[PDB]
Amino acid sequence: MKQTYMIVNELDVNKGGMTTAMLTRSKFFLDNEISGDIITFDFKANYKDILKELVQSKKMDKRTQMHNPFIYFKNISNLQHKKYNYTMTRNLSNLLKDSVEIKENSRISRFFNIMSREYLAYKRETEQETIFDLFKNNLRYKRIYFYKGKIVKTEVFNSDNNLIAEQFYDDNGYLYLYRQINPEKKSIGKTYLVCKEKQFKNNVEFCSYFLDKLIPDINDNIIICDGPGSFPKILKTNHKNVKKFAVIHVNHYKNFDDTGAVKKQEDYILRNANKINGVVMLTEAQKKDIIEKYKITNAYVISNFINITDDYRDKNDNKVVGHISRLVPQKGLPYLIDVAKKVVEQDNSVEFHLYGTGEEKSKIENLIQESNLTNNVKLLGYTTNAIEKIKDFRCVISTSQFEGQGLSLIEAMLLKKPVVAFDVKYGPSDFVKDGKNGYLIENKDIKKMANKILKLLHDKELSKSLGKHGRDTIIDMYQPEKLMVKWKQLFN
Numbered sequence: 001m002k003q004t005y006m007i008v009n010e011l012d013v014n015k016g017g018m019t020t021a022m023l024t025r026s027k028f029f030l031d032n033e034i035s036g037d038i039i040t041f042d043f044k045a046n047y048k049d050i051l052k053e054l055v056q057s058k059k060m061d062k063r064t065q066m067h068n069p070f071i072y073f074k075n076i077s078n079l080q081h082k083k084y085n086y087t088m089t090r091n092l093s094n095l096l097k098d099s100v101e102i103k104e105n106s107r108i109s110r111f112f113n114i115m116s117r118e119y120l121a122y123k124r125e126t127e128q129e130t131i132f133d134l135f136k137n138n139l140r141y142k143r144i145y146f147y148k149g150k151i152v153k154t155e156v157f158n159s160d161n162n163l164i165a166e167q168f169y170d171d172n173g174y175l176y177l178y179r180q181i182n183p184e185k186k187s188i189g190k191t192y193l194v195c196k197e198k199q200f201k202n203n204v205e206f207c208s209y210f211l212d213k214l215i216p217d218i219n220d221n222i223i224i225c226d227g228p229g230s231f232p233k234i235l236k237t238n239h240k241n242v243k244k245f246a247v248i249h250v251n252h253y254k255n256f257d258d259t260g261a262v263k264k265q266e267d268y269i270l271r272n273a274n275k276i277n278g279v280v281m282l283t284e285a286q287k288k289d290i291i292e293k294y295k296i297t298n299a300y301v302i303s304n305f306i307n308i309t310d311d312y313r314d315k316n317d318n319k320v321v322g323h324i325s326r327l328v329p330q331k332g333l334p335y336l337i338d339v340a341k342k343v344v345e346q347d348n349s350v351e352f353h354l355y356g357t358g359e360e361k362s363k364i365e366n367l368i369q370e371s372n373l374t375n376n377v378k379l380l381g382y383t384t385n386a387i388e389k390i391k392d393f394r395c396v397i398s399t400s401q402f403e404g405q406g407l408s409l410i411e412a413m414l415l416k417k418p419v420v421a422f423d424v425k426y427g428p429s430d431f432v433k434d435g436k437n438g439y440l441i442e443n444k445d446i447k448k449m450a451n452k453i454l455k456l457l458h459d460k461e462l463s464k465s466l467g468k469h470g471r472d473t474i475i476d477m478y479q480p481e482k483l484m485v486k487w488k489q490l491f492n
């Protein structure tokens with residue numbers, strides 16, 4: 001049967017967006033006898049520890065594997081030697097051979113050659129990590145990295161101490177990879193593979209070659225590009241039999257813009273749409289605006305699997321409005337404090353709870369101070385247990401000006417809760433049924449959002465009845481077996 005290779009630049013912990021969605025997608029795929037392997041392109045010396053924590057935290061599937069061009073070309077370079085080459089290590093043992101070791105503490109140390117009458121290098125020693133910074137006239141020109149007893153990587157610097165080149169070593173202590181890095185532009189340039197004895201113009205070229213070397217061109221092996229900046233590496237491949245679909249996650253338009261502009265990264269993925277086997281997106285509304293901005297015929301509509309099956313008995317009848325989302329501009333919290341100003345104007349017993357951490361903490365604190373809704377509108381901060389404090393809220397307001405699918409609300413609905421959400425660009429219009437499960441209010445209409453939010457708070461039954469429909473509405477639209485069937489229809 002057919003095997004999948006999802007694509008993104010990096011994978012780590014504390015990443016809860018694209019990564020979570022890609023990793024969730026893999027789980028369902030394996031259950032439908034299709035492999036959901038990930039492809040990354042960055043160098044992590046400890047990439048093995050990061051992958052094990054994700055599996056242990058039940059965020060990654062044991063069956064999901066990760067392909068990386070540092071791991072791949074190391075395992076191939078490892079084959080061409082038998083013994084460990086301590087050449088680099090001894091070259092360093094030879095640079096510091098006759099130098100005084102000034103141990104500043106248990107971690108920091110400096111080497112001084114009496115004959116050279118100048119400090120030669122610095123040593124930072126920690127648990128399983130030892131770094132060497134080498135100098136010439138008190139100017140850093142090199143950095144030697146050690147991890148698990150062996151040299152893993154060396155970094156070369158210039159006069160301005162800016163990174164000019166990186167070198168990657170295999171498990172037999174040999175140079176298998178190295179690249180040029182533009183000093184000021186901090187951009188990856190001329191990449192040189194050693195075991196292939198090949199030269200790549202940029203990282204994009206190298207990674208295309210890495211995909212050609214990893215994914216065997218065949219009708220079965222399908223490539224799903226999820227990372228927007230990862231697409232050039234997938235568009236410029238030599239595969240002729242391997243299928244390639246792109247997925248637009250967030251809203252494609254340039255955020256908080258009225259000029260009809262589209263984010264550069266996401267603009268390029270849609271202009272080369274023809275070259276791909278199809279450009280898939282979460283909402284049907286985006287399939288229209290995409291056939292408007294790019295007149296595409298390959299655009300498909302498949303939603304990101306909903307991993308929420310929460311069933312509970314809501315009895316907490318308290319006048320409280322909840323908004324669990326990061327404090328990013330796209331959430332438009334300033335509208336939420338306008339809605340709160342009109343809500344607390346009629347009913348002074350209505351409390352506003354905002355949960356999350358981000359770039360607008362001081363913006364909201366000065367906004368809450370204005371109008372003096374201090375005890376009413378409060379910030380609860382980051383919380384692991386979202387469901388528990390959500391179960392307590394009477395209703396969930398979304399003042400977000402743009403969104404991908406409205407995951408924040410799709411979750412509040414699954415927690416049988418009413419939702420007064422602003423009609424968003426590819427947002428609530430897809431699930432929020434005005435009067436049936438919530439209140440889709442036209443954007444920038446505080447007054448319309450306020451009176452409706454008050455109506456939910458002033459009707460213990462209506463709010464519970466609307467919310468009861470909410471969970472059933474989401475379960476009905478977003479069905480795994482048919483979502484998987486939509487995926488299968490693209491693969492077949």
Ligand SMILES: O=P(O)(O)OC[C@@H](O)[C@@H](O)[C@@H](O)COP(=O)(O)OC[C@@H](O)[C@@H](O)[C@@H](O)COP(=O)(O)O
Nearest residue numbers: 008009015016017018019188203204227228229230
């Ligand atoms: O041209 P290159 O030199 O090869 O590299 C420059 C390139 O333009 C960058 O690598 C891209 O910004 C990164 O590409 P991606 O968009 O595929 O990276 C994914 C992104 O970093 C994303 O934020 C990540 O998956 C984790 O997100 P989350 O924490 O929301 O789940």
